[PDB]
Structure formats: structure tokens, C-alpha cells
């Protein structure tokens, strides 16, 4: 399973991050060893977001 929803709006100016809106669904494509960031896919493309800003959806 790799479906999640954003807990909060997240928007960074940092290159290679993805902006997400609270309530938006996303899928996780890649993780990191420490689990703090993950590469997400939404209708707006792909990029990295903080893992603590998302939560799974069955």
C-alpha cells in the first residue's frame, strides 16, 4: 500500500519538493532510509515531501 493524504498544506521554495494541499491524496514512489522525506506523486507531478505531513488511506 502507498496511498496517503496530506495532513497540512506543504509548499517549499526548495527545488525538487512537491507542493501539496491539506486533504489531497498522493502516492509514495520512493522512501529514504530515515523515513523523514518521501517522493510523492499527485496530479501536480512528483517531488519530495515530509513524511510527517502525510498519513495512509486504505
Q: Which stretch binds Na ion (CB under 5 A): 2-10, 14-22, 26-34, 48-56?
A: 48-56
* Binding of Na ion by 9 (CB under 5 A): no
C-alpha dihedral sign at 15, 48, 43, 30: positive
Exposure string for 9-37, b = 16+ CB within 10 A, e = fewer? ebeeeeeebbbbeeebebebeeeeeeeeb
Q: Which stretch binds Na ion (CB under 5 A): 2-10, 11-19, 21-29, 42-50?
A: 42-50
User: Smallest distance, Å, CB 10 to Na ion?
Assistant: 10
Does the protein bind Na ion through residue 32 (CB under 5 A)?
no
Amino acid at each position: 500500500p502507498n496511498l496517503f493524504v496530506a495532513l497540512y498544506d506543504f509548499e517549499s521554495r526548495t527545488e525538487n519538493t512537491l507542493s501539496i494541499t491539506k486533504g489531497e491524496k498522493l502516492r509514495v514512489l520512493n522512501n529514504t532510509e530515515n523515513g523523514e522525506w518521501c517522493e510523492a506523486q499527485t496530479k501536480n507531478g512528483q517531488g519530495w515531501v515530509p513524511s510527517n505531513y502525510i498519513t495512509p488511506v486504505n
